[PDB]
Amino acid sequence: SHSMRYFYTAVSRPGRGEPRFIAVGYVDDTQFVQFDSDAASPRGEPRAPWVEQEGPEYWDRETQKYKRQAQTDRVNLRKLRGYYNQSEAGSHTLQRMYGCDLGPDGRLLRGYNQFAYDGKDYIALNEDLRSWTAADKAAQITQRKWEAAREAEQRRAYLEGTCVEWLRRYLENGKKTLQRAEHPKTHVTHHPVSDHEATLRCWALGFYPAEITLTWQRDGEDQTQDTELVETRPAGDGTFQKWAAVVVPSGEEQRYTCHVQHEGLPEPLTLRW
Amino acid sequence: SAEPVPLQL
Amino acid sequence: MIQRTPKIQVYSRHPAENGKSNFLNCYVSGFHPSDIEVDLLKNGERIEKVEHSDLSFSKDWSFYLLYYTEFTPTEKDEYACRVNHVTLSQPKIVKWDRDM
C-alpha cells in the first residue's frame, strides 16, 4: 500500500526574471524533501530522518536535478505563454506530478507523469506508460513533440526501475514509521441544536495513514447524503485528523451508529453516544 | 530520488 | 487561468487542555493560485512565531498549506486564523473552536 510522489510548482512573476520553483517529494503521507528556488544558494532539504543517513553527495545530485528543473520550467512557462498567446505581464502556474505506486512484490503497480497549467489539466501519462492524454490544442503540441521524441518510452525506465528502487530503499530505511499503521482514537460528541435536533459528531484522531474513512448509519442504513464531513487534516506530528457529523431528532440518537475503517484497525469499529 | 533529465514541453 | 477559493480548518494538534501546551493549526486547502496570506491570531493580533509546511497539491491540482504555532489554551485568549487570496473579497477570519 505504498507510493512515492513528486510535486513541482512553477510560478512565473510579471515581466521577465527567474520563475518561482518549488519541489516536494513524499513517501505516502510522509514528506522527505523540499526545494525552494527562493534562496540565493538553493539546496535540497531533507524532511525525514530516513534520507538524512543518505550521503552528502546524494544531496548535491538532488539539488542539481531541481536546479535543472527550475531552469527548465522558465522555458516551459515561456513556451506555454506562447501556446496560449499570452503576454509576459501576469503570473502563471505550471504543476507537474510524477511518481510510483508499489505493486504486491517489488514491481511497479502504477506510474504517473502529468501536468497542469493554471490549475487545469494539461497533459497526462496514461497507465500504459507508452501513451499521453492532451487536454487542449496546446497540449497536443507537447503531445506531438513527445510522441516524435518517444518521451513516454524514455520516462518508463524511471517509473519502473528507479522510482521503485528508491521507494523500496526509503521503506526499508524508515520501516519503523513508514511501514506501520496507527489506528484512529474514536469518541462521539453530542451537541443539542434545538428542542427537536442534536448534532452527533464522530471524531477520528491520531491516525496514520490519511483519509481512511468514517461513516454514520441510521438503523443499518448508510447516511451518504446527510453526513457532514470535514476534509482530512494533518495534526502536524505526522498523524491525521477527521470527523463525520450528523444532525439527528431530539431523542433518536440511539438509531445512529458511527463506523470506522482503517488499516490500523483489525476490525471496523462501531460507536454511539 | 528525483527523475534526472527535466521534462520539456 | 482558473481561480479556487481556500478551504479553512482551525484546530489544535492534541485535544484542548486549559493551561497545558498544544500546537494551533490552520489547514488551508483547495486554493489556486499558490499566492496566499495565512496568519494565526491571539485576541485578533498577529502571532509572529507561526511556522508553515512546504507548499504542495492534491489530485485536482489545488494547493494546501499548514500553518502552526505552539500554544496554550485558557478560556479567555481567543485564537483565530485569517486568510487572504485573489478569490476573497475581504480576508476570511475563522475562530478556533475547541470542538471544531
Numbering used by the authors:
A (entry chain A): 2 to 274
B (entry chain C): 1 to 9
C (entry chain B): 0 to 99
Q: Which lines from the publication concern this structure?
A:
HLA class I molecules, encoded by HLA-A, HLA-B and HLA-C, are highly polymorphic and can bind and present a range of intracellular peptides to cytotoxic CD8+ T cells, as well as regulate innate immune responses by interacting with killer cell immunoglobulin-like receptors (KIR) expressed on natural killer (NK) cells. While much is known regarding the role of HLA-A and HLA-B molecules in protective and aberrant immunity, comparatively little is known about HLA-C. Compared to its counterparts, HLA-C is expressed at lower cell surface levels, is less polymorphic, and has evolved to have more extensive interactions with KIRs, thereby playing a key role in regulating NK cell responses. To elucidate the role of α1/α2 domains and the peptide-binding cleft of HLA-C on differential expression, we solved the structure of HLA-C*05 in complex with a HLA-C*05 specific peptide, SAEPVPLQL (SAE), and HLA-C*07 in complex with a HLA-C*07 specific peptide, RYRPGTVAL (RYR)27. HLA-C*05 and HLA-C*07 differ by 22 residues, of which 15 are located within the α1/α2 domains, with ten of these being involved in peptide interactions, namely Tyr9, Thr73, Asn77, Lys80, Tyr99, Asn114, Phe116, Trp147, Glu152 and Arg156.
